[PDB]
Write a protein that binds this ligand. Structure first.
Ligand SMILES: Cc1cn([C@H]2C[C@H](OP(=O)(O)O)[C@@H](COP(=O)(O)O)O2)c(=O)[nH]c1=O
Ligand SMILES: [Ca+2]
Length: 135
């Protein structure tokens, strides 16, 4: 796997950010994570939804360097969103959320699962600390 620069355009929610990637604006969906939703008629605004969104927002907007890291499989989902691990100043946003109890490790579709163990570890830790979603 290898990281590549990208430039923030706009944070959308806990698990979705719009980035300028190789001169093209594109929506990125964070691999292996599921944050409570904010925007949707179906299951409305879930608890921690606002919290997950603010955390991703703050994390990426405060970064001086954003990097994108694709996995080994498909790089886009059916909605045309890039599927990646996003790094803000070297910190993986996907793991940060999980670690904080603001996302569940989800949507594990092989072979796009290189960091699954890593994330599972952090999830178990947030669970053990009864953080947010796990409180
Ligand atoms: C994270 C991720 C989501 N998706 C799909 C599964 C879901 O499809 P459906 O829309 O059929 O439920 C949707 C969830 O996106 P969000 O959680 O952003 O809503 O995106 C993938 O296809 N691959 C992925 O790796
Ligand atoms: Ca979601």
């Amino acid at each position: 796997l290898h990281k590549e620069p990208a430039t923030l355009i706009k944070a959308i929610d806990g698990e979705t950010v719009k980035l300028m990637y190789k001169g093209q604006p594109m929506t990125f969906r964070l691999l292996l994570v599921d944050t409570p939703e904010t925007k949707h008629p179906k299951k409305g605004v879930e608890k921690y939804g606002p919290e997950a969104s603010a955390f991703t927002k703050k994390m990426v907007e405060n970064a001086k360097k954003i990097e994108v890291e694709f996995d080994k499989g498909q790089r886009t989902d059916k909605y045309g969103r890039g599927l990646a691990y996003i790094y803000a100043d070297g910190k993986m946003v996907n793991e940060a959320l999980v670690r904080q109890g603001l996302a569940k490790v989800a949507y594990v579709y092989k072979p796009n699962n290189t960091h699954e163990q890593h994330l599972r570890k952090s999830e178990a830790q947030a669970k053990k600390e009864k953080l947010n979603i796990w409180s």
